């Protein structure tokens, strides 16, 4: 990206709900190009989350994502022999991506029996803004507010 | 050409007062509207006298190099030049065309090899890049050297549109003793010019007049 700027591939929407957002999610959860088996785990987790937690499947997703979404972050930088930490205000599209990514990662780093149950309980926890993924947003802010001086 | 005949084309129009070169005091009628007005009393006899010597030169099989690289007039100089079986330079003059002719001559050989090969040698079997890449080279050489491609030697005279714009070509001529005939506008330096023709050197209507006149007298001088 020295010279060549680019657009971004605009992936197809989630097959079940027609959501580009959930397509960004299944892909992020996907491993070894196992798309078939990835969306299976995302839905069953949404189905587990939907059925027994007040429904509104897309909305349930947002309530949880709303909570792990980070408004600002820090970008490392090396000036006069010094590695300064510059807090940057982060753009909406990626805001979702980090939010989704930390939810997925916290789910695999969990004790429950399957990825679907884990994913479901991560969303639930995030929905109540608690657990690992939310905590990942908070460290980002503690780390950001600290270097507030250099913005 | 006639005083009446010239006036219509606007040969009499010159540059502003602010841009004049003082050496050209004799040939300025005066000025109006902060613009210099050239003297057509002075222009015509001097111009006719230019045509005579050109007519003489052409009648001993003399080679005439038309020079005028203004973008606006580049085409007109070509047609003017070809209409009398002579040679031209109609895009950026390469410094040393005359003084370094032996080296620039090689580029002429290159030109011919290229258009000859692309036609009689034909190729058209290429690699797909060479079609344009060789045309690229040929395209360039054509603008640069299309007009003198068959000149063979050093010209016997130069006819120049705008002495300041073409100061390089006029300077090479000077060094080689080649006589220079030039349209020399109020802002320019007439010192390099053996036969100074003072009039507008921009306006396509004015340019074509001298040039149209020049190419015509070559043919008369040729027709003998």
């Amino acid at each position: 990206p020295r010279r060549r700027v680019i657009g971004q591939r605009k992936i197809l929407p989630d097959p079940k709900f027609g959501s580009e957002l959930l397509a960004k999610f299944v892909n992020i959860l996907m491993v070894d190009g196992k798309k078939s088996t990835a969306e299976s785990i995302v839905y069953s987790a949404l189905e587990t989350l939907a059925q027994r937690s007040g429904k509104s499947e897309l909305e349930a997703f947002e309530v949880a994502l709303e909570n792990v979404r980070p408004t600002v972050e820090v970008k490392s930088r090396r000036v006069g022999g010094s590695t300064y930490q510059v807090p940057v205000e982060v753009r909406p599209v990626r805001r979702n991506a980090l939010a989704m990514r930390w939810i997925v990662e916290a789910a695999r780093k969990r004790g429950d029996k399957s990825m679907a149950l884990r994913l479901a309980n991560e969303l639930s926890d995030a929905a109540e803004n608690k657990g690992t993924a939310v905590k990942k947003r908070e460290d980002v802010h503690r780390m950001a507010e600290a270097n507030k001086a250099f913005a | 050409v006639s005083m009446r005949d010239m006036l219509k084309a606007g040969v009499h129009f010159g540059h502003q007062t602010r841009y004049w070169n003082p050496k050209m005091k004799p040939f300025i009628f005066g000025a109006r509207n902060k613009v210099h007005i050239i003297n057509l009393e002075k222009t015509v006899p001097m111009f006719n006298e230019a045509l005579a010597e050109l007519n003489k030169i052409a009648s001993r099989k003399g080679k005439i190099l038309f020079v005028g690289t203004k973008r606006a007039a580049s085409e007109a100089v070509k047609d003017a030049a070809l209409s009398c079986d002579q040679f031209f330079v109609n895009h950026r003059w390469l410094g040393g065309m005359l003084t370094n002719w032996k080296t620039v001559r090689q580029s002429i050989k290159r030109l011919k090899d290229l258009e000859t090969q692309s036609q009689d040698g034909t190729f058209d079997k290429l690699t797909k890049k060479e079609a344009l890449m060789r045309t690229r080279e040929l395209e360039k050489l054509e603008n640069s050297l299309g007009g003198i491609k068959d000149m063979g030697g050093l010209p016997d005279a130069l006819f120049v549109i705008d002495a300041d714009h073409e100061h390089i070509a006029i300077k090479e001529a000077n060094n080689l003793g080649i006589p220079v005939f030039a349209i020399v506008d109020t802002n320019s330096d007439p010192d390099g010019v053996d036969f100074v023709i003072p009039g507008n050197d921009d306006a396509i209507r004015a340019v074509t007049l001298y040039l149209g006149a020049v190419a015509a007298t070559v043919r008369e001088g040729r027709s003998q």
Binding site: - | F123, D124, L126, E130
Partner: protein, 206 residues
């Protein structure tokens, strides 16, 4: 860096194969070795016959050698004699019956192989390498080469430190697949070892 063999890269494009017979895997190896043994035999016996190139093809149960030579009378010998004696031993080496064809090399100074051999033989005679090269170039151009270069490598003039040197007149676009580039090789076995000669000749395009 390393350059691609300019004869090889152009095979199928503007350069012909020198072996052009067909054969299945069964006998492809045997045919290819038989080719080697005949080319070798002929290349020795005709060393002083300016043989620049040997084409071999194998129609049905036959083999026919074409000897491209700048000295056909030599190769042929008085009333077919030398042709004939070559035939009878090619046929031995080949196994199958054999026929020999002879193609004149009209202008050998444009033939890279005979250029390279000519310089090779000249280094063995004790000619100076700059001369031999420069005679080759000059000759090649006055006869209408679009370009030529000849390289010489290793221990020029018996120098202790081995050197590589080339001369080049005109035009030699080696990256142009279209370009008729005639390329070949020769080794000069000298009193102080081996001097390799490479030669390129550009003859126009398509």
């Amino acid at each position: 860096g390393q350059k691609v063999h300019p004869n090889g890269i152009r095979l199928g494009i503007v350069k012909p194969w020198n072996s052009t017979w067909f054969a299945n895997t069964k006998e492809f190896a045997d045919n290819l070795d038989s080719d080697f043994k005949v080319r070798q035999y002929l290349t020795k016996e005709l060393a002083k016959a300016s043989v620049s190139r040997i084409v071999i093809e194998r129609p049905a149960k036959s083999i026919r050698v074409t000897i491209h030579t700048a000295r056909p009378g030599i190769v042929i010998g008085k009333k077919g004699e030398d042709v004939e004696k070559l035939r009878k031993v090619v046929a031995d080496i080949a196994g199958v019956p054999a026929q020999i064809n002879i193609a004149e090399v009209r202008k050998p100074e444009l033939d890279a192989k005979l250029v390279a051999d000519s310089i090779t033989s000249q280094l063995e005679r004790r000619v100076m390498f700059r001369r031999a090269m420069k005679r080759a170039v000059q000759n090649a151009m006055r006869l209408g080469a679009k370009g030529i270069k000849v390289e010489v490598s290793g221990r020029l003039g018996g120098a202790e430190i081995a050197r590589t040197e080339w001369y080049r007149e005109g035009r030699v676009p080696l990256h142009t697949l279209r370009a008729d580039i005639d390329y070949n090789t020769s080794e000069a076995h000298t009193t102080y070892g081996v001097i390799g000669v490479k030669v390129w000749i550009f003859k126009g395009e398509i």
